[PDB]
Design a protein around this ligand. Structure first.
Ligand SMILES: NC(=O)c1ccc[n+]([C@@H]2O[C@H](COP(=O)([O-])OP(=O)(O)OC[C@H]3O[C@@H](n4cnc5c(N)ncnc54)[C@H](O)[C@@H]3O)[C@@H](O)[C@H]2O)c1
Ligand SMILES: NC(=O)c1ccc[n+]([C@@H]2O[C@H](COP(=O)([O-])OP(=O)(O)OC[C@H]3O[C@@H](n4cnc5c(N)ncnc54)[C@H](O)[C@@H]3O)[C@@H](O)[C@H]2O)c1
Ligand SMILES: NC(=O)c1ccc[n+]([C@@H]2O[C@H](COP(=O)([O-])OP(=O)(O)OC[C@H]3O[C@@H](n4cnc5c(N)ncnc54)[C@H](O)[C@@H]3O)[C@@H](O)[C@H]2O)c1
Ligand SMILES: NC(=O)c1ccc[n+]([C@@H]2O[C@H](COP(=O)([O-])OP(=O)(O)OC[C@H]3O[C@@H](n4cnc5c(N)ncnc54)[C@H](O)[C@@H]3O)[C@@H](O)[C@H]2O)c1
Lengths: 238, 238, 238, 238
């Protein structure tokens, strides 16, 4: 019955979220460049797309048609350029901000009318501990800016769409074991100082993050909107 | 199998949380001055106590004995003195801070060893939108101070007990329909300006708040600790 | 002796900041489309530019040449498209994000080497109460997103440039009497609900905001960096 | 002309603040157990008191009489019990909360009428990075709770007293070189992991913190109230 679109649903956190939603009985479509294999394994509809180039409006239209509706949107598609501000080019800055922020806006804007028609919707953007900090030993100014910007977008859309039955929140994972953060794990000068600040003493498994994502995509969030929810093993609280 | 103690479990939010936990299969004990009737209706163990006077350590000991263990602690017992700072006496200030904050510390401190023995625990303190604001048109300086203090306590205990398998979080409800907030609802100069700032356009039902409380008292919060989670219909985001 | 560039220095807050810096003995250059008259009145160097189109790098180069150095950067140039998310076009979204955020990054990136050479620098971005909220009754999703994004950029640049002697902060004014907010003041449904939330009971004068801006552009901020400083008459605290 | 009372004014940050206020032409009184020597060196009026036992109301009365008025209140008196929550006794918990929080409330409550009579006042509470975190490797749950509670009190009093001409803020210093933090500096396992997170790469000198305190005790803060201002060398932003 609930129809969901998960971008970045072929790997890591996005895949875990798609998995959790399927487990809840949702009909799910995953979008990535080569989603076929993961979709078949997952029991989801594959929607091939390059979100760094393709019109987000088109993906939402394809999702609506493929699923027979659209109630949930999760934007997990990931990219990054880990360079200090003085080294980063404007092109690289825009590449990161476009996929993380602009596409978030465009996807949500396109999906909202469908959720409104159903009188129920859930938009879940993915933030980071960098929504509240600058990444510590890691040089990620563009990413930090984009993930913090998402909290403003979250509040803004939540405010405007609340009466339409749509809830908009920002899931902020801590340090999770996925391919995206391999560079962090392979550099002791990055991994050790960071992990020393995680009270639980370990990084998260994608499925542990997805447990909370599912909640934010369900009836549990009926009165929860315009908020960031950090699932970081205690990192920010340290 | 999971054993839970819910103070303030005979009415409002606390009762709704106790209800939600029983629905999850948890064995629950509710503590309030006259919990008998609610406990029988709820399917919970009654633990009569006046938390404004009785040693919190004693209540935890009684809960452990009554339930055959203790994995979850929810402190919802409520009181307030709605007077401006210049009118408030030190006694009144202490009355509010004691029940909301000191008792939170004492209950958690007493419960932690039991959760640690089990290798799994959940502590849920109850915050407020006043954990982030001063209550707007309502004169509640002591309450605001206590609910904000709880976020510091939440971070502190989460940091220290993470390795013991205990998660500590602060559920921050927005404006909820309970007896505690009747004064707000019966004064147009309070109710209208506040409600105009709630994007969803309505106050919450206790059960809607409890849906999230249950999550924070379950496996969904395995990697979620030291955080405030606001369930306010968009109020803070407005 | 300290050389400062203030974009948006011909009117409102930017003009007040330029004024305050000149009062501190700083040599100031103001940038706007037609800065001549204000510059002459102010005792500042005029730098004509259209920051919605002209390469930010070029403006910084011109400022360095005009002032004989560059130690302080204040980005106050303003624009907005007050339309709800579902009405806003991607072009309009980009127009707001470009001037408020992208240009902030580009200007700071270009100015940093000059501040580093001097071993002392101050970057002051201008945030808003929308860095922490969604603007309440005002439909400003793009602006909210940009002003919140600036806090991430502030933290990121502050972290990377601290050792170079540069401090980076975000001054977040509340509701100020300038031409930019005239639309808010001329609509009772906007002005009254907002002002009712300002404890001081009145909007700010640009010079009152500039008093704090000057501090963040001086030696007082030697150990203050990567922070937002809200000057809002108590609005956020309400 | 402006009269100020600085508790904890004989050493460290409090002394530096008293010094900065005297430099601004304020008539200052410092309160500590043995303030005589520092007061004479400082050019301030000594007010002997043990704030862990003596009625705060009495100190304010003595300050009013000694200074011929009272416009500014800075509460820097310090104490701490660095023990984990499970080791900490309720007495120790109360000792920390009383001096840091209860006394802050009592002093401000007593001073407000004097500031109101003058139509101008400044209350400056002292927070910490633990107003936003749990202290990292340092076991300070009571202190963390108290310093976070102060932000709630700050917002609450700022809201209620804004119309009286009083501004109330929370100065949150990072890691400062004073006797109070010697234990941190003498333990490599504490000092190194903490300092590695300070972008500026060094701890602050008390006078650097006082530069900002003075601003919050002056006309610069005319429109700044109910806020925390962190002066931490970039620690929180890291
Ligand atoms: N890994 C972490 O520790 C961590 C922490 C906080 C936030 N996040 C956020 O979580 C989200 C998921 O990241 P992850 O770690 O699971 O990454 P991942 O590398 O495991 O997965 C990235 C997904 O995005 C997809 N993708 C990449 N480029 C794409 C494109 N051009 N078009 C469509 N899809 C594309 C991939 O195919 C994949 O399905 C991101 O928004 C990321 O910034 C991750
Ligand atoms: N109602 C709201 O809108 C709202 C919003 C944010 C936070 N909260 C918080 O939620 C919690 C619950 O409040 P609520 O609105 O459900 O209140 P409520 O009046 O509905 O219930 C209060 C509970 O505390 C109990 N209680 C009162 N005094 C007690 C004592 N001395 N010893 C033991 N138990 C005692 C009552 O018997 C009852 O079970 C509180 O911590 C409150 O501050 C409420
Ligand atoms: N007015 C408020 O209540 C308020 C509140 C919070 C934040 N702010 C922020 O403060 C800053 C200043 O706004 P303000 O209210 O003083 O506005 P303003 O209208 O008074 O001044 C705007 C300045 O930007 C300049 N400008 C506009 N377009 C430009 C362009 N294309 N190129 C170069 N300069 C251009 C103007 O010429 C002028 O000097 C902005 O960043 C704004 O978002 C304002
Ligand atoms: N040192 C830091 O790195 C740091 C960081 C953040 C916040 N703070 C806060 O700054 C404030 C000042 O601390 P500090 O580091 O300058 O400490 P300090 O040890 O240098 O000075 C403490 C002051 O409090 C006084 N004092 C102690 N007990 C007293 C009592 N019973 N009655 C009256 N006065 C008493 C002392 O005599 C002294 O003047 C405190 O509120 C502290 O928690 C300090």
């Amino acid at each position: 019955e609930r129809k969901a679109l998960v971008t970045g649903g072929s790997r890591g956190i996005g895949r875990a979220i798609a998995e959790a939603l399927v487990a809840r009985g949702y009909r799910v479509a995953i979008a990535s460049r080569n989603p076929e294999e993961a979709a078949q394994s997952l029991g989801a509809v594959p929607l091939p797309t390059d979100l760094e180039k393709d019109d987000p409006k088109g993906l939402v239209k394809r999702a609506l048609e493929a699923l027979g509706g659209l109630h949930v949107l999760v934007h997990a598609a990931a990219v990054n350029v880990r360079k200090p501000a003085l080294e980063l080019s404007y092109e690289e800055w825009r590449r990161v901000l476009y996929l993380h922020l602009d596409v978030a806006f465009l996807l949500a804007q396109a999906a909202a009318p469908h959720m409104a028609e159903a009188g129920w919707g859930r938009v879940l953007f993915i933030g980071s501990v960098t929504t509240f900090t600058a990444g510590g030993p890691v040089p990620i100014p563009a990413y930090t800016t984009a993930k913090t910007a998402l909290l403003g977008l979250t509040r803004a859309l939540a405010k405007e769409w609340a009466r339409l039955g749509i809830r908009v929140n920002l899931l902020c994972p801590g340090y999770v074991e996925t391919e995206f953060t391999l560079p962090l794990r392979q550099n002791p000068e990055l991994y050790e100082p960071i992990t020393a600040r995680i009270p639980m003493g370990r990084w998260a498994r994608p499925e542990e993050i997805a447990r909370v994502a599912a909640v934010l995509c369900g009836d549990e969030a009926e009165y929860l909107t315009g908020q960031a929810v950090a699932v970081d093993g205690g990192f920010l609280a340290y």
